[PDB]
Amino acid sequence: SHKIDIPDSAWTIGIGEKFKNAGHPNVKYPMIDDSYVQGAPLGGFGAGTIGRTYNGGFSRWHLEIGKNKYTTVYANQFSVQVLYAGGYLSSWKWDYPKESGMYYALYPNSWYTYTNVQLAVKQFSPIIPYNYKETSYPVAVFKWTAYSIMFTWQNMIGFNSGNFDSEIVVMGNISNWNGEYSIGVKKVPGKAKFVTDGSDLWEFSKNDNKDDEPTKQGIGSAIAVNFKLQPGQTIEVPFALSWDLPIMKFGGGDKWYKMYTKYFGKNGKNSFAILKEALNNYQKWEKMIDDWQKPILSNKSKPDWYKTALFNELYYLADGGTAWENGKVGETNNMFGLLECFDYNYYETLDVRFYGSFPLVMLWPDIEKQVMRQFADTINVQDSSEFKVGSNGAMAVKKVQGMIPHDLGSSYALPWIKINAYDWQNPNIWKDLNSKYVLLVYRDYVLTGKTDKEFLKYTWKSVKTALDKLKEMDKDNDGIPDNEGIPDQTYDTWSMKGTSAYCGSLWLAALKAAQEIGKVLKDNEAYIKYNEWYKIAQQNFEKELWNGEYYNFDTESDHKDSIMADQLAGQWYADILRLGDILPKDHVQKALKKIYEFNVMKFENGKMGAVNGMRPDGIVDESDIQAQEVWTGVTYALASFMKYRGMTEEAYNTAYGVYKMTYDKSGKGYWFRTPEAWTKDGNYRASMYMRPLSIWSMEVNY
Amino acid sequence: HKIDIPDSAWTIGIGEKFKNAGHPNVKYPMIDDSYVQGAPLGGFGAGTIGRTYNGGFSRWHLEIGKNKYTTVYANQFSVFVAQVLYAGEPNGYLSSWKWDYPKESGMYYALYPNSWYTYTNKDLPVQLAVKQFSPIIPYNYKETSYPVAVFKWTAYNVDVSMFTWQNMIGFFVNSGNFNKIIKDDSEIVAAVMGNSNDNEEWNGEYSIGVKKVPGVDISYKAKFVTTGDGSDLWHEFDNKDDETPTKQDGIGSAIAVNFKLQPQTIEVPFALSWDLPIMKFGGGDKWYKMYTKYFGKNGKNSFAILKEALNNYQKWEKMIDDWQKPILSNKSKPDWYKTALFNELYYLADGGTAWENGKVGRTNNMFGLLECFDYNYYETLDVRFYGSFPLVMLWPDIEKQVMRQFADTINVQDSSEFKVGSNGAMAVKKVQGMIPHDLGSSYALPWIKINAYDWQNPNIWKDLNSKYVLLVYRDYVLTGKTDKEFLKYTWKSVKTALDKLKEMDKDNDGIPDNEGIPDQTYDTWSMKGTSAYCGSLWLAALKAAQEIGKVLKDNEAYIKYNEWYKIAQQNFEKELWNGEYYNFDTESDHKDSIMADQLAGQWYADILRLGDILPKDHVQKALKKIYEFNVMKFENGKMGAVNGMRPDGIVDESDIQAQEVWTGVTYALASFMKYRGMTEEAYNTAYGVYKMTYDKSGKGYWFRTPEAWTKDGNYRASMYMRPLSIWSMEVNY
Numbered sequence A: 001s002h003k004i005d006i007p008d009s010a011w012t013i014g015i016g017e018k019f020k021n022a023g024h025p026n027v028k029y030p031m032i033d034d035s036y037v038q039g040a041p042l043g044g045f046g047a048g049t050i051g052r053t054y055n056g057g058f059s060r061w062h063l064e065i066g067k068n069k070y071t072t073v074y075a076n077q078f079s080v081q082v083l084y085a086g087g088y089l090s091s092w093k094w095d096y097p098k099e100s101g102m103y104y105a106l107y108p109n110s111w112y113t114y115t116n117v118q119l120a121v122k123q124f125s126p127i128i129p130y131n132y133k134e135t136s137y138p139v140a141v142f143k144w145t146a147y148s149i150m151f152t153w154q155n156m157i158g159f160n161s162g163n164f165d166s167e168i169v170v171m172g173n174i175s176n177w178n179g180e181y182s183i184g185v186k187k188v189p190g191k192a193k194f195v196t197d198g199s200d201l202w203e204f205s206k207n208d209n210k211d212d213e214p215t216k217q218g219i220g221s222a223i224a225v226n227f228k229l230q231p232g233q234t235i236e237v238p239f240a241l242s243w244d245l246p247i248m249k250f251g252g253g254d255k256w257y258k259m260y261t262k263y264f265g266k267n268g269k270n271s272f273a274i275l276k277e278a279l280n281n282y283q284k285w286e287k288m289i290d291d292w293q294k295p296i297l298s299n300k301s302k303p304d305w306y307k308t309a310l311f312n313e314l315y316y317l318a319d320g321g322t323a324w325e326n327g328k329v330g331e332t333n334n335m336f337g338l339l340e341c342f343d344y345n346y347y348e349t350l351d352v353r354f355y356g357s358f359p360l361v362m363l364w365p366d367i368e369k370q371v372m373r374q375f376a377d378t379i380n381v382q383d384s385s386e387f388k389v390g391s392n393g394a395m396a397v398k399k400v401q402g403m404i405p406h407d408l409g410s411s412y413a414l415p416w417i418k419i420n421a422y423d424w425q426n427p428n429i430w431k432d433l434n435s436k437y438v439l440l441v442y443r444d445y446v447l448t449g450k451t452d453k454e455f456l457k458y459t460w461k462s463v464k465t466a467l468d469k470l471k472e473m474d475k476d477n478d479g480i481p482d483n484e485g486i487p488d489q490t491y492d493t494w495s496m497k498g499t500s501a502y503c504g505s506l507w508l509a510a511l512k513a514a515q516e517i518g519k520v521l522k523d524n525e526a527y528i529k530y531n532e533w534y535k536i537a538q539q540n541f542e543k544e545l546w547n548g549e550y551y552n553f554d555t556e557s558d559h560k561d562s563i564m565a566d567q568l569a570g571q572w573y574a575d576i577l578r579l580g581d582i583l584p585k586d587h588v589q590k591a592l593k594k595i596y597e598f599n600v601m602k603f604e605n606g607k608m609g610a611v612n613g614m615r616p617d618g619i620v621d622e623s624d625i626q627a628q629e630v631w632t633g634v635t636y637a638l639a640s641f642m643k644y645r646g647m648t649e650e651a652y653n654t655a656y657g658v659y660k661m662t663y664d665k666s667g668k669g670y671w672f673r674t675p676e677a678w679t680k681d682g683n684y685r686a687s688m689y690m691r692p693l694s695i696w697s698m699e700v701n702y
Numbered sequence B: 001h002k003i004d005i006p007d008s009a010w011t012i013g014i015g016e017k018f019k020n021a022g023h024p025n026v027k028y029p030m031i032d033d034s035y036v037q038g039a040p041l042g043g044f045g046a047g048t049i050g051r052t053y054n055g056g057f058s059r060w061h062l063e064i065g066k067n068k069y070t071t072v073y074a075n076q077f078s079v080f081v082a083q084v085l086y087a088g089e090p091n092g093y094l095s096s097w098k099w100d101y102p103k104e105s106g107m108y109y110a111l112y113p114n115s116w117y118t119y120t121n122k123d124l125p126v127q128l129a130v131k132q133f134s135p136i137i138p139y140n141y142k143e144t145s146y147p148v149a150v151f152k153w154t155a156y157n158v159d160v161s162m163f164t165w166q167n168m169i170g171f172f173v174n175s176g177n178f179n180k181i182i183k184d185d186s187e188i189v190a191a192v193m194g195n196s197n198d199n200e201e202w203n204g205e206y207s208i209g210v211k212k213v214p215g216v217d218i219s220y221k222a223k224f225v226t227t228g229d230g231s232d233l234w235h236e237f238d239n240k241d242d243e244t245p246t247k248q249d250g251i252g253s254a255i256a257v258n259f260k261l262q263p264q265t266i267e268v269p270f271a272l273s274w275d276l277p278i279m280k281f282g283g284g285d286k287w288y289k290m291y292t293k294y295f296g297k298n299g300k301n302s303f304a305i306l307k308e309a310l311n312n313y314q315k316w317e318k319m320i321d322d323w324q325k326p327i328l329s330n331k332s333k334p335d336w337y338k339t340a341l342f343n344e345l346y347y348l349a350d351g352g353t354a355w356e357n358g359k360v361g362r363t364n365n366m367f368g369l370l371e372c373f374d375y376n377y378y379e380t381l382d383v384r385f386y387g388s389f390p391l392v393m394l395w396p397d398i399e400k401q402v403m404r405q406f407a408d409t410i411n412v413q414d415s416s417e418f419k420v421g422s423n424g425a426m427a428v429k430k431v432q433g434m435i436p437h438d439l440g441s442s443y444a445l446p447w448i449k450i451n452a453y454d455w456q457n458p459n460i461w462k463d464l465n466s467k468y469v470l471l472v473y474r475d476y477v478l479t480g481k482t483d484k485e486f487l488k489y490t491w492k493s494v495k496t497a498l499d500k501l502k503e504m505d506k507d508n509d510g511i512p513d514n515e516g517i518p519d520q521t522y523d524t525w526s527m528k529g530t531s532a533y534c535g536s537l538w539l540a541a542l543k544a545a546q547e548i549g550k551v552l553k554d555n556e557a558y559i560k561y562n563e564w565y566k567i568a569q570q571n572f573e574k575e576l577w578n579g580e581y582y583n584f585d586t587e588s589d590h591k592d593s594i595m596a597d598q599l600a601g602q603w604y605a606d607i608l609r610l611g612d613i614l615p616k617d618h619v620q621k622a623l624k625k626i627y628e629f630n631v632m633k634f635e636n637g638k639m640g641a642v643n644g645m646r647p648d649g650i651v652d653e654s655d656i657q658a659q660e661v662w663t664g665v666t667y668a669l670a671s672f673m674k675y676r677g678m679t680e681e682a683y684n685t686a687y688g689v690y691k692m693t694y695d696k697s698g699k700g701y702w703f704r705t706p707e708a709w710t711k712d713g714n715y716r717a718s719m720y721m722r723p724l725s726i727w728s729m730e731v732n733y
C-alpha cells in the first residue's frame, strides 16, 4: 500500500474503471477492436504472450503466433473474494468492487494494489535489453506483498480431452498444440484437478487438498498461500506462470520451434524447469530491469508522460505476434519476425520497420542485424507467378529481382519462405523500400559503434543492387526515381508523382549512406558512382521542390504543394546516421517550423499529433484519407527530428498528442494497443501497430 | 468531477496526515506552523488569509508583517445530512455543528493563484467541488491588490443546500461589532460584518456574499453567536436581520443557497472581501493599503469590493488562465517543475507584503516584501538579488519602485551607533555610499528607518553594493532595454556603490578584500582575501556599469570601469581558477571548498547578456564540479546543492552555512545550469528542492518553502523570499 516500487511515470488506472470515450475503427472493412480492457503483456520474444488486463482477467491470447484471440479465460485468477473486476464457476465471489484498487504499468513491469488486510503484486517477465536468453522465456513472475492468496489456472491445452536448497510447489496432455502450462509458488518463512459450478475448489472459502494425477470433457489446478499477519507485519510471496508450447505453426504448413527451446529443450514437458528458474532468479531479473531503466527514469528534465510512452510502447516487441525460430520441426541462425500488426498480417514490413525498429537496433541489436540479413538474402529472389493487385486489379510479378520485398510473409501462410504476402499494391515498383533498406543497414552499423564491418560485407551486394534498380526508375533524367502517380510507397493510398519530398529525400540519404559504406570497404568504383548520382539528385531535388517556406509534396500531383509531415524523412535519418546536411539547415529548420505551425497546430489544437497532409491555407488536405490521418509512428519520428534540431518545445508538444490520445483520461483508450492512425474525431485504424515504436528514436543521443 | 484542474496541481487528500514533516534545526526561537497549509487568499498588500488543505481559514497575515496561525472555527463552508466541510474539531465553542469531515473522502488541489476542493463522501450522494482564488495577474497593478477571494462552487433527485464567517473586527476583543445585510443586470445578497468610525488599524469591515444564478434560492442568517454552541444557526440547517451592536459575545453571519438538482450541474459563486484600509507598524507609522486607491480609505467599502468580484470573476479566470498557458501548454517541461514554478509565487502575497497609498494624516506607491517572518526585514537586498525574479518578470513596475527606494537610500548617513548582535561591538547604523541591508522591519518603521537588521554590520559587506548594481541593470534588461529613465534615476547610486567598494581593495589587485570577519551574506561561513562569490559579483557589476555608461554617454565612467574590470578579471583568474573550479577564496582555512554560489556574477552576467566575464570552458567545468560534488554527493542528489563541499567529497564542516542547502541558491544554480546546456543536471538539481518541499517523500514545506535545510531535512526560516528564484529558470533567450 505504498511500500512497493511503483515509479511515478507508470500508467495508472482504477481497477474496474469504465472509460466512456473509447474510439472505434474508422473503416468499414474487417478490423480488430478488443476495446479498452487491456494491460501490459507477459511473455518473452517468440514465446507468445498473454494480456493480463487492468480488471485482472487473463484476456488477450497471442499464444498462437501471429493471431489475436480476446476472451477472458475466467478460471485464471488470483483470489484473496476473487480479484477480477467482473455461466460457469458460479460459486466464486465475482464483481470485485470499484474505487477499491489500482493498476500500474511501466513495461515490462506492472502492478496491482488491492485496497477494499491490504495486498499488492508486481508482475513482469525478464524483458531486458542486450539479453537474448531470458528475454526469450515463456515466463511470468508475480511478486505479491501483503501488509489466503491463491493462483487458480485452467488447463489450456487445446484452446480438452487428455489432460493430467530452494522450496517451491503442471497441466499437460497424455500424448508424447501439445505442451504444458505450469503455475506454482515458492516457500518463504511463512489442489490439482478442478471442474471448469466450481464449488469443487471454492472450500477454499474457509481454509480441499486433493492431488489427482485425466479427463475427456474442464480440468484445472490451484496453488494457495496461507498465513496469519501479526499486526504491523508485512510478508512477501513470489508466484509464477510458465508455458511450454514449443511449436508454432502457420496457416500455410510450416511448423517451427520457439526460441526458448534452445534453453529448455524442444520436448514440450519442461514447464516446471522454466517456472523453477523463474522463482529462484526473479530477484536478479528485477535488478537487471531497474538498471537499464534508471538512466531515463532518473533524468528529471524529461516529463513523466514521455517516460510512460517510451517504456510502455515496448509492449509490442513481444506482443506483435512475434516469431523467433529455433529450427523447423523435421530437420546456425534464429530467424526473427515482428508483425506490422494483426489486421495487416505481414512480418517485418520494411517500410514500417524503418520507423518501428529503433528499439531493436538500440536495445537488441543482434536481433536487428539478423532481420536485416534476412532482407539481404531476399533481394535477388525472383518469383514470376503473377498476382492480382488489390487497388486497381492489375496483374503483376510477385517478386522481381533486385527489389527489396515489402514483407517476409504472413502468419496465415509461410513466414520467411513466401514473401510479399502484401497485395494491395505492387511492392516491386515502390520507390521508398530500396532506399529504406540501404538506410536501415547503415543505421544498424552507426548505432552499434561503426565496428561491424562483417555486417556491411554481408549486405553490400544487396545495397548496391537496391540503388541500381531504383536508378532505373528515373524516367526524366533528373537523377531521382519518379513516383508513378499511384501509391508506390508506405502511404499506400496517397499517390505521389514525379519527384516527391519523401521518396526523394530517402534516395538522397540512401546515396550518401552507400557513399560512406563505399569508403569503409575500399571500393572507389561504387564511391564515385554514388557521389556523382548524389550531386545531380541533390541539386535537382532542391530546385524542383523548395518553395521558400517548405519542400513541396511533389512536382506532378494536383496536391503537389501540400505540406507533408514526413517531407524530410531522408534528412531525419541522415542526422541519426551522421551523414550531415543533405539539405540546408535553414530550409530544414524552416520546413520543421511549418509542419509544426500547420500540420500540428492547425489540427485539433495540436493535441492529437501531426496530421499527414496540410494545404498551404491551413486546412487538412482531402486528396486521400491518409492525408487526413495522424500516423502515430510518423508523429513520434517527427518529434525526434525536431528535438535534434533544437525545436525542443515543439518536439514534445508534437509527441504529447500521441501520448494523450493513447494513454490519458482525455484520450481514446488505446493503451497497449497503439494504432497506426487516427482521424480528427480520434477514431482509429489498425490497432496494435509496429510503427509507433519509433518513439525510441527520441532517445538517440549525440 | 466536471472541472478543469491542471495536471501540475499540487494535490493532497483532505484530512491526510503527514508522517515525516521537518522542524527547526536551530536552538533560537523559530516559527513552525506545521504541514497543514494551503494557497493563500488575497492580493498584494491587502493582507492574506491561508485556508489550509483541511478547509480551515488558519494562517492570518492580515496584520501586515505578522503571522498568526490559529483556526477561526466559525469560518467555513457547510453541505446539507448536515456537515461542515473542515477535517477537524472546534476545546469548546460552535459545538452543535457537524465536525470531523471524514478522511479518505476529498482532495485539495493547488496551482497558485487558483486552488480547488473536491468533496466525495459515501453519505453525500450529491458531489461538490470548489475552485477558490484572488485575481493575481501579471502586468496588472489593480485587481492584483484587491482584498478579495471568489469561491466558484460546482455541484453535480436531491436538493443540496452555507458560507459562515465570524466578524473578525477586533481579532487584531469584540465590542461595537454589527452585521448588516445588503441586497443589491445581476442580483447579490451579502453580509457585512463591521463596527465606530475611526481611521485606526483594527477598524473596517469584512463581508461575504453570493450571486443569484437561475435554479438556486438564497437564504441568510445574520447574527449568530460565535462564542455560543452555534444552535442559533445549526438548528435552521431564520432569515432574520439584527443590526444590534454586540458587547462581550463574538458575532458572525452566514450566507447560503438552496438548490434542486436532478440526475444536472449547478455553478454558484460565493465570495469573501475585507476592507481594513490601514496598516500600522510597530513603531507607530500608519499607512493606507494599495487597494484603497480603487475603492477608498474610510473602511466601509467591503461590499463594493465583493460586488466587483461576483460581477467580474469569470473575466479574471480567463486572465489567470491566459498567463498560465504558455508554461502549462509546454509539454517539454515536467509537471513537478510547473507545480514549483507557480506555487512558489504564493510568497509575493504571503510575505508580509506592504504596498502603500499614503501615510495616515505623493506620486509613488512604496512597496515591500519580507525576507521572511522570523527575520522580519523588508526587501533584504541579498535575498532579493535571488528572489525578486517573479517581480521583474511579472510585475516590473513594482520592481523598479523597489530599486528606486534603494537608489534613494545609498546616500543616507545615520551616524548613530547600534550594538552588533553577533559580537557586542558598536558600529555605525548606516554609512553613506553603502547600500542598506534592508528597508526596515514591520516591528519598527518600514521605508523610514532602514537597516533594521543588527546581527552583523552590513556597512562593510562586500557583496551588496555589487548586487544592487546588478539588480538595476537586470531590471533595465528584463524590461526590454528601453527604460532609460530608470537608468538615469539610478545612475549616481550605481557609481557611488561601485566607487565605495573599490576603496576596500586594500591589496591593489583590483577586487574588494574580504576581511575574515562577517562581511557578506555567508556571514558565519566567512571569507577572506578575494572570494569567488564577492569577486565574481564585482566583475559582473563593473561590466554592467560600463554598459549603463555607454547607454547614458558617460565616457569618463565607461573608461574607468573598463580599466578596473580588465585588471580585476586578470587577477580573479590568477588567484582562484584551479582548472576544475574556482576556489572559495585565497586566505581562509576552507579556501579550496567547492561553493555552490561560486560563480554568482556570471549567472547574472548571462541574464544581463554581459557576455563571458569568465571563460565558457571554466564555467562549464565549475558547474560540472558543483553538480558532481555539491549535489550528487550530498544525500545522493535528492535535496538540492549543499553550499560547501571539500575537495575530498566530504561536506565542508567549517560552518553551519556550509552544510545547509539554501533553496534560493539551488534554484539559481539550476537556472544557470539550464542556460549553459546542462539540462539534465539543472532539472535534477532543482528537483530535490521540489521533492523536499512538495512530495510524499519530502518534509512538508508546501506554502512555507524555507531558506534552508541540513542533511536530515530539518529547516531554517520557513516562509522565505529566496526560493522565488525558481523564476530565473523561466528567463527567455
Ligand SMILES: [Ca+2]
Pocket (backbone or CB within 6 Å): A473, A474, A475, A476, A477, A478, A479, A480, A481, A482, A498, A499
Ligand atoms: Ca525522376
Ligand SMILES: [Ca+2]
Pocket (backbone or CB within 6 Å): B504, B505, B506, B507, B508, B509, B510, B511, B512, B513, B529, B530
Ligand atoms: Ca583585493
